[PDB]
Design a protein around this ligand. Sequence first.
Ligand SMILES: CCCCCCCCCCCCCCCCCC(=O)OC[C@H](COP(=O)([O-])OCC(O)COP(=O)([O-])OC[C@@H](COC(=O)CCCCCCCCCCCCCCCCC)OC(=O)CCCCCCCCCCCCCCCCC)OC(=O)CCCCCCCCCCCCCCCCC
Ligand SMILES: CCCCCCCCCCCCCCCCCC(=O)OC[C@H](COP(=O)([O-])OCC(O)COP(=O)([O-])OC[C@@H](COC(=O)CCCCCCCCCCCCCCCCC)OC(=O)CCCCCCCCCCCCCCCCC)OC(=O)CCCCCCCCCCCCCCCCC
Ligand SMILES: CCCCCCCCCCCCCCCCCC(=O)OC[C@H](COP(=O)([O-])OCC(O)COP(=O)([O-])OC[C@@H](COC(=O)CCCCCCCCCCCCCCCCC)OC(=O)CCCCCCCCCCCCCCCCC)OC(=O)CCCCCCCCCCCCCCCCC
Ligand SMILES: CCCCCCCCCCCCCCCCCC(=O)OC[C@H](COP(=O)([O-])OCC[N+](C)(C)C)OC(=O)CCCCCCCCCCCCCCCCC
Ligand SMILES: CCCCCCCCCCCCCCCCCC(=O)OC[C@H](COP(=O)([O-])OCC[N+](C)(C)C)OC(=O)CCCCCCCCCCCCCCCCC
Ligand SMILES: CCCCCCCCCCCCCCCCCC(=O)OC[C@H](COP(=O)([O-])OCC[N+](C)(C)C)OC(=O)CCCCCCCCCCCCCCCCC
Ligand SMILES: CCCCCCCCCCCCCCCCCC(=O)OC[C@H](COP(=O)([O-])OCC[N+](C)(C)C)OC(=O)CCCCCCCCCCCCCCCCC
Ligand SMILES: CCCCCCCCCCCCCCCCCC(=O)OC[C@H](COP(=O)([O-])OCC[N+](C)(C)C)OC(=O)CCCCCCCCCCCCCCCCC
Ligand SMILES: CCCCCCCCCCCCCCCCCC(=O)OC[C@H](COP(=O)([O-])OCC[N+](C)(C)C)OC(=O)CCCCCCCCCCCCCCCCC
Lengths: 50, 168, 230, 118, 173, 450, 72, 98
Amino acid sequence: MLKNKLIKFKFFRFVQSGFYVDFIFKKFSEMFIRNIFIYSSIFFGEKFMI
Amino acid sequence: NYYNIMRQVSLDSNPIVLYQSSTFTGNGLQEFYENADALTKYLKLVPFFLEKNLYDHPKQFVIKMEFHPQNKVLSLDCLTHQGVLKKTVNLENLIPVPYEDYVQFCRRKLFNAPLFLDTEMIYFNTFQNEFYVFDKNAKWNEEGINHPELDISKLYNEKAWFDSLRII
Amino acid sequence: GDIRHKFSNEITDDDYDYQRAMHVKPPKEESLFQLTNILSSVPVFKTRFFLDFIARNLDTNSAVSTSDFVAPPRVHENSFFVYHSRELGNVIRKYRSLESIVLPGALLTFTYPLFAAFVAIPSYYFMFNAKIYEMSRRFVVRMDVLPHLEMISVQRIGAFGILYTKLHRIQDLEYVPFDQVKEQENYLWAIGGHGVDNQLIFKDRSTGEFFYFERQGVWDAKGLNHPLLN
Amino acid sequence: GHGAWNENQQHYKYSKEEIEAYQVPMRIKAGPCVDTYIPLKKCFQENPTSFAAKMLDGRKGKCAKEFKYYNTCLNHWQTYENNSHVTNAYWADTSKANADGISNTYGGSFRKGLAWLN
Amino acid sequence: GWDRPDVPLSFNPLYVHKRELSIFDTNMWMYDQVYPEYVISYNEIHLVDQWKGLKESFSQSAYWWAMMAMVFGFYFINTTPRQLGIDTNDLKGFLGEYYGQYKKRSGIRSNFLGLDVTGENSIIQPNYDRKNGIRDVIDSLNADAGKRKLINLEAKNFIERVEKECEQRILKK
Amino acid sequence: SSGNFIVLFLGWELIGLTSFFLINFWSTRVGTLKAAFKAFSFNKLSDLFLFFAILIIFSTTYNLDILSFNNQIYLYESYNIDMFYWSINLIEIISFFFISCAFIKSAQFGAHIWLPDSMEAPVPASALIHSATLVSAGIYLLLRLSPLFELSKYAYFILPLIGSVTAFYGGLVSAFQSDTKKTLAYSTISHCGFLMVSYSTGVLEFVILYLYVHGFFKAATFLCVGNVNRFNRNIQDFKRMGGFYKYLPFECLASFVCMINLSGLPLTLGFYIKHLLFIGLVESYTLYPLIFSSLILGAIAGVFYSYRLFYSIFFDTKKGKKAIYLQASRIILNSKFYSNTSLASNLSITFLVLISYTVILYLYCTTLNNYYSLSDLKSIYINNAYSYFYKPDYNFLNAVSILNWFVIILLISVIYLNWRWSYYYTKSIDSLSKFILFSFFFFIFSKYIL
Amino acid sequence: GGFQKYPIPRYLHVGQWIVNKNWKWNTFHMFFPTAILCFMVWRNSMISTAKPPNYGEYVDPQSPVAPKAIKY
Amino acid sequence: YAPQKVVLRNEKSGYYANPDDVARRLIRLISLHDKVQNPSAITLKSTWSEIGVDPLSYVEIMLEAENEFYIELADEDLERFRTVEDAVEFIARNFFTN
Ligand SMILES: CCCCCCCCCCCCCCCCCC(=O)OC[C@H](COP(=O)([O-])OCC(O)COP(=O)([O-])OC[C@@H](COC(=O)CCCCCCCCCCCCCCCCC)OC(=O)CCCCCCCCCCCCCCCCC)OC(=O)CCCCCCCCCCCCCCCCC
Ligand SMILES: CCCCCCCCCCCCCCCCCC(=O)OC[C@H](COP(=O)([O-])OCC(O)COP(=O)([O-])OC[C@@H](COC(=O)CCCCCCCCCCCCCCCCC)OC(=O)CCCCCCCCCCCCCCCCC)OC(=O)CCCCCCCCCCCCCCCCC
Ligand SMILES: CCCCCCCCCCCCCCCCCC(=O)OC[C@H](COP(=O)([O-])OCC(O)COP(=O)([O-])OC[C@@H](COC(=O)CCCCCCCCCCCCCCCCC)OC(=O)CCCCCCCCCCCCCCCCC)OC(=O)CCCCCCCCCCCCCCCCC
Ligand SMILES: CCCCCCCCCCCCCCCCCC(=O)OC[C@H](COP(=O)([O-])OCC[N+](C)(C)C)OC(=O)CCCCCCCCCCCCCCCCC
Ligand SMILES: CCCCCCCCCCCCCCCCCC(=O)OC[C@H](COP(=O)([O-])OCC[N+](C)(C)C)OC(=O)CCCCCCCCCCCCCCCCC
Ligand SMILES: CCCCCCCCCCCCCCCCCC(=O)OC[C@H](COP(=O)([O-])OCC[N+](C)(C)C)OC(=O)CCCCCCCCCCCCCCCCC
Ligand SMILES: CCCCCCCCCCCCCCCCCC(=O)OC[C@H](COP(=O)([O-])OCC[N+](C)(C)C)OC(=O)CCCCCCCCCCCCCCCCC
Ligand SMILES: CCCCCCCCCCCCCCCCCC(=O)OC[C@H](COP(=O)([O-])OCC[N+](C)(C)C)OC(=O)CCCCCCCCCCCCCCCCC
Ligand SMILES: CCCCCCCCCCCCCCCCCC(=O)OC[C@H](COP(=O)([O-])OCC[N+](C)(C)C)OC(=O)CCCCCCCCCCCCCCCCC
């Protein structure tokens, strides 16, 4: 094996970042927060329904 | 990128002596054995030779150094556990090094050195990747060392002297 | 700048002497149990028997280099040498020689030679092949030029340390920039390419074989300046 | 004497009340070596010793007479639990074991690793 | 050495608002008077969005899948299963009680006061005709214990047979 | 030390709140408040799960006493609960909620996102929370309510898989990490995964031994890296650390000992915990291939992070700012009192290491000795795992050698592998050749020629 | 090591770099009374403490201390 | 101990580091550069162009100055600097911890 892609900084930082799990979860949590706590609850809920 | 290109130098007719150890002033390991001081210094250097051999530390105890200005080459007589050997060095390949650099070149903890090993005057041949260590109890030829060809104004190179040997 | 002398109970160099084992300082005094002191004191080592044993049974001065100019024996009666490897060549030779002792010895000694082979296989393929073996295969132990053939003879280390020489035409030699091969063989240059020069790689176009030259290798000015190579 | 590995020196079987008194950990109570364990625990209680001494003493010092029975019982218990006496025989000679099946149940599924092809 | 001036008020810099605080971002900014911050920090911003993050994560984790496959293959072609299970000396116990409960069926007995109510009349009720859950694990453990006992018995039979054969060979000479 | 579920829940909420305060110690900064709020949200989720489980237990049995629940759960094992549209097994649902809260508080895969961000706390708080205080709450729950989980199908399937996945993930991320506190946090995640897998094996003695070893040595390593960070002026990344062996002599040697013990390495107090875990690992799982491969990878991952941390912090080339070294290299500072750390700190670390060694030896004698002298665990589930510790067979003895030699090769790689040009490249290769040949000859003489 | 010290307003009751001259007597009068309170709590709670039998003791099933089932 | 009386912030001198030492260290760093020819000609009032620092050499010298002084200098401040006087003044008045 003369060509190894795992030693490159791309894979190095991928592994160092905990497999991007935190980034993905934070993005999904932001989506949930924005959709549920503001648009659906405050505006659609408080402004329209109430 | 520094490349070891050889120039095929030769010795000149009349050399100028620069270094002469007060001990080992005699000629031959037999003379060293028969001389009291030479024998004890040889015994004290036995660990030095052991470090040379088993620890792969390239170094040589230098005595009776001469200089050839016509070709600018130093002829060094070195004492090894077997006897006296003659070596030739080009001034372009010789640079000074600190004693701590000499010690740290080897990755093995060197044996406690004797008190007659001149630590200040330790030099390094970059072509051979080797160290030259002189004796404290020695005589230096002032006129010889003050030769124009030995002047730092001509033999000085910042990149070679300061950046060639980076032990880390 | 130092004010330790102003206090009677302050630490001293005599108190710091114990750090000389872990700290590098020039020698100050010789202890009674140092090797130098023991050898110079005990009269046994002064015996001619011990002195002659030291003189004979150890590395010889004959093999010690005596000059900065080296003229190795000619490979061919009409050839002239150009490049030669000093230390990395010997190291590679000694490493590849292990295949003649460890391997048969492992077969005849290990209880589970298959287990040894199964462990070695992945070890070879990762962190060993690219580390040493490929570099050794492409390593140039020696290079000479035969003018009558207008060829270059290159010596290489083979399996089990065997040395073999091969001829390559000067017209088939090309320079391969390191940029064209760094991505292809990043791992090789990452872990094993340090010994050889990165920017002085050549290859034979006809046979597609590379030539790695040691950084601490000796070149001949006359050989480089010969018109055939210029 | 001449008792089985589970019986103790006195050939005495302790009752449930005695076990509760000389409370035995469930780990030991599950196995068959309660009779040989209780005398050893009683001896240790009578002659308490430090953990360093227990580790560094290969014969358990004072409590050696009871530890002999306990150690024999422990060896038999663990060997029968893991079936090591049959597994080792199959490992030593699978071919002969199949020839005179020590236990066909284990022999039919045993397969030594390819790496261990002594 | 130098006499330093007292710690600068600049260390905490007053933050001046230059953009409207949209009501659509309510509580989405960690409000502060010096260093306001977004509620969520995205250090791995080289990934444009989570979807590309998932793609990159799986593409790179393929390497770890390959490593796991190779390790498992090496252990699989070089090892054999071990004998594991409940102690054969403790069948009456954890395994015994598990089946004992279903045999007793004590949870559906008649009420002590004579009330018409009984088991199966609550949100949490007993189901003694159930065969799922830990039943499979218990059955596997019981089968493994039985198999180990059978192996021991077969070994005993083998040693007895060898002794008898040796005795007969000695006698027939 | 809770006598009933109400006291247990009180302690649960209290550790959550106090961990929040410790993380948010730097109250002036709102960046710290974000990490504190992340931890707070996860803790509140765990509180919800624990509260719901306690409510289910109270509804089933009109009692909250821990001993009574442990000794009664077997009777109600056969019961089911009628939920919205499914009839869920009572034990399964209760164990599901307990395991969920335990995973959240132990920072298992998925729920571990808060632990890396909790490192904003000061190093003493980080050490205390990550060694045996905050990240072992789930382990305590499992150990205390073991009779419940022994009859849990969900526990059987989930504990080993999640434990092994967390072990592998934490080990590899810690190996590739560059920050000291982050490395220790991911190592803590990996060791918590190993603890989960040990509990899955079902030898509570092994779980307790693993817990003690990990807690002691993790705390000691945390203290050492805290001294290193304080010397380096709050820069926790070792890319700016180099040649600190001379400036922090005590920290170097203390870290060496603590790390060799923490990362399970041969001939150390921390090797036996992993050995016992692999001894007890069960093989009836459906996902056994993935579980075993993840466990092996996580176990080997210890070497890389230990080596990187130690070498990069102490014996690597000087990478830090010139000021860090010059401010301390001034000759005026040369004195009998000279030190870059605290004498009280050094004494505290030394005493911690000594007491940890003594306590671990006491536990090893109690459990792993031929004479079993541990107190009653109040559990009637016997795993048979001690059979392969008392009378191991040739198969298992040779199987362990595979992992031993994997670790050996990895050690050789991290030691003799060159990534940068050096004056010692050829001599390093020569030393490797000498070591290989000498090892072969030494083995020959030891085994055959004597 | 630590941050540079900066002035703290006198009127503000905060703990920044607070050191008390009488801390010795304050500790003396805060430790011992707390010890007495805890001693009182401990002796109050010991009345409702339970311990299992000793090494040489067994619980008689018919003794009053032994657990008793409900009699309908 | 702080007196019970009200004490106000004491801005002794705007410099948080010895300005003379800062200036001398910066001048030595500048002289180390290859483009710089005469260290003697360098003064606090000398502009970068006249002392010989090219626009590209300036960023290298400033990066090494950041490394030497244990601080980070913003591009805005580096571009605002017009003389060694301004450079040393900013560095000396900078609170190394911001
Ligand atoms: C900061 C540090 C960072 C970390 C540093 C780490 C340093 C170490 C790095 C390496 C460590 C391992 C990493 C993981 C693997 C990475 C692989 C990779 O990246 O390659 C990408 C590379 C492609 O991208 P590229 O740009 O060409 O990459 C450059 C090359 O790497 C350049 O290669 P090259 O041209 O130089 O030549 C080398 C070549 C050749 O190199 C080698 O071959 C290396 C030696 C391999 C030894 C494997 C031993 C496994 C252990 C058990 C056996 C022991 C031996 C026992 C005795 C013999 C057998 C009895 O390399 C390869 O071809 C790839 C290596 C082999 C990858 C195999 C991955 C697992 C495959 C599936 C599992 C197989 C195991 C059994 C599974 C059983 C069921 C669970 O090659 C691949 O595609 C990878 C494999 C893809 C597999 C796909 C699925 C299987 C395919 C179908 C099979 C159908 C079989 C049907 C059978 C039917 C029977 C009836
Ligand atoms: C009738 C007379 C018979 C005499 C028989 C003599 C037999 C001698 C056999 C020698 C065998 C080889 C020994 C090799 C040692 C070095 C190994 C090494 O470093 O290799 C790793 C080396 C790397 O290690 P390194 O740290 O980098 O090396 C740095 C230097 O080596 C620098 O190394 P280092 O200084 O850092 O440490 C090296 C150290 C290694 O030493 C040890 O590790 C041994 C530690 C002691 C073990 C003691 C065990 C027995 C006693 C147990 C306790 C009894 C307690 C009794 C009750 C006490 C109540 C209070 O070397 C020694 O073994 C020294 C000898 C021990 C002297 C002290 C023994 C205790 C005396 C009694 C107590 C008093 C002590 C002093 C006062 C203390 C304060 C009060 O790897 C290599 O590359 C090796 C390459 C090969 C080098 C070979 C050099 C020697 C060549 C010799 C050729 C043959 C000459 C034959 C001459 C014959 C003339 C007739
Ligand atoms: C009862 C039987 C049941 C059988 C069921 C079988 C089920 C099969 C399901 C297959 C599912 C395939 C899904 C493909 C999704 C693609 C998504 C996509 O488009 O992504 C774009 C994306 C590229 O776009 P991009 O923008 O360039 O990406 C940017 C990256 O940064 C760029 O990344 P980078 O360049 O830095 O490095 C990326 C690198 C990543 O490194 C690798 O991929 C190398 C290592 C791959 C390991 C794969 C898993 C190993 C096996 C695990 C099995 C676990 C389950 C079974 C366990 C059994 C236990 C007993 O990959 C490469 O670049 C190398 C490309 C070649 C990869 C190998 C492709 C193999 C395809 C399958 C061949 C099967 C032949 C069968 C022949 C049979 C003859 C009889 O794709 C990738 O990055 C590569 C993804 C590679 C996924 C490979 C998955 C293979 C799974 C094989 C399973 C075999 C099971 C056999 C069971 C047998 C039982 C008897
Ligand atoms: C499924 C199939 C599995 C197959 C697995 C196969 C495993 C076995 C592999 C066998 C490998 C055989 C290697 C042959 C090595 C020689 C090759 C060669 O030509 O090299 C010549 C090389 C080079 O030859 P050269 O001609 O270049 O120079 C001569 C040597 N120098 C260089 C020094 C001048 O010479 C040698 O290396 C000579 C080695 C001689 C000794 C060989 C055996 C040593 C081990 C003995 C047994 C173990 C120790 C026992 C000790 C007992 C003590 C009581
Ligand atoms: C059969 C085909 C040819 C196989 C050739 C053999 C493999 C390749 C060459 C290996 C040379 C290195 C041998 C080191 C021997 C060390 C002592 C020993 O354990 O030998 C007996 C053992 C085997 O003897 P055994 O089989 O009687 O041991 C009992 C079985 N075990 C150990 C599994 C319980 O040696 C090995 O296990 C060697 C494994 C293969 C190593 C492959 C290369 C990786 C290592 C790089 C070299 C440096 C290793 C230094 C190790 C130092 C100690 C940790
Ligand atoms: C194929 C055979 C079956 C087994 C399958 C698995 C194959 C082996 C997979 C090994 C993966 C190891 C990943 C380690 C990642 C470390 C990351 C890190 O900290 O940075 C790098 C650190 C070094 O950190 P550093 O800080 O010193 O420098 C880093 C430098 N850069 C960033 C430029 C890379 O450690 C290493 O470099 C060592 C890892 C690379 C060498 C891996 C050799 C593997 C040898 C496998 C032997 C198998 C024996 C046979 C039996 C195996 C199965 C039982
Ligand atoms: C100014 C005073 C400052 C405080 C000084 C305190 C000094 C403490 C020194 C010892 C601490 C470390 C002990 C070893 C580590 C633990 C070992 C272990 O696990 O136990 C195994 C052993 C247990 O015994 P064993 O393990 O040998 O086995 C016993 C054998 N059987 C079971 C058969 C009986 O414990 C120890 O060795 C620890 C010492 C005994 C316990 C001492 C407790 C009472 C302390 C009295 C002094 C009180 C001072 C008050 C000062 C107040 C100041 C305000
Ligand atoms: C079909 C798909 C369904 C998907 C459902 C997904 C629901 C859960 C989504 C996650 C967020 C849930 C709301 C809580 C947000 C907390 C934000 C916060 O505290 O910020 C701090 C942090 C932000 O801090 P940070 O990590 O970005 O940065 C701080 C760290 N330093 C300082 C280092 C930078 O928030 C997060 O990272 C996300 C937290 C996720 C964990 C939330 C725990 C509570 C889960 C409640 C589940 C409720 C389910 C209800 C039913 C759903 C039915 C579909
Ligand atoms: C009868 C039995 C005993 C009766 C005792 C009943 C005790 C009831 C609880 C009392 C709580 C007292 C809190 C005082 C807080 C004072 C301010 C402070 O600390 O600084 C605030 C700091 C800084 O304060 P500051 O320095 O700005 O101001 C201090 C001076 N004052 C407030 C007067 C101006 O601010 C914060 O960041 C808030 C931190 C709050 C931390 C609270 C932690 C409480 C932990 C208690 C653990 C108890 C475990 C119980 C276990 C058993 C449970 C059953």
